Amino acid sequence: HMQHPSHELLKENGFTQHVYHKYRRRCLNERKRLGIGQSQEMNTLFRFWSFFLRDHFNKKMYEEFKQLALEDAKEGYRYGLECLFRYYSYGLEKKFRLDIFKDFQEETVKDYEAGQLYGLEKFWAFLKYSKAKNLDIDPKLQEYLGKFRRLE
Numbered sequence: 001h002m003q004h005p006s007h008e009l010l011k012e013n014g015f016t017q018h019v020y021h022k023y024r025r026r027c028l029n030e031r032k033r034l035g036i037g038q039s040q041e042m043n044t045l046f047r048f049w050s051f052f053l054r055d056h057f058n059k060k061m062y063e064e065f066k067q068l069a070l071e072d073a074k075e076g077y078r079y080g081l082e083c084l085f086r087y088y089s090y091g092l093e094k095k096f097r098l099d100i101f102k103d104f105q106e107e108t109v110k111d112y113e114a115g116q117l118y119g120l121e122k123f124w125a126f127l128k129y130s131k132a133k134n135l136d137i138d139p140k141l142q143e144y145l146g147k148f149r150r151l152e
């Protein structure tokens, strides 16, 4: 009776367009009314996307997740982007997608150049867990990953 909409939507047969649309609408409306980073309901949506897209990818949903996460991080509220990096690392481990991998590299490079390591650690973690071989890794990103190689 008290279960959160995101909890229902993450069940195997639990996702329905009707429930998700009403949930997404309220979250986005709260983000606009209360402001970026000020809506805890919006944070649950970031968390939902981070998990749900691993098993049920959809281009437009991912692109909205990505766009809002980056908007929030620019304002200084990084939960959305942390959810995105977790999606990249765990999601690409589950099923590799070339276009999503390219985004993963691009956002990791930006994250590192902004003085953060959360993205770089998640990329390094992906490399340790994934079975994917012959990856085409940005030469600049390989250089950044060199910091972690000397540590282990």
Ligand SMILES: CN1CN([C@@H]2O[C@H](COP(=O)(O)OP(=O)(O)OP(=O)(O)O)[C@@H](O)[C@H]2O)c2nc(N)[nH]c(=O)c21
Pocket (backbone or CB within 6 Å): 086
């Ligand atoms: C095995 N775990 C997992 N965990 C915490 O429970 C949550 C889910 O585990 P997780 O998603 O694998 O950690 P994760 O988020 O991927 O790594 P990180 O939080 O650094 O981004 C995370 O906040 C993780 O830090 C743990 N916390 C404590 N104190 N002890 C533990 O053994 C564990």
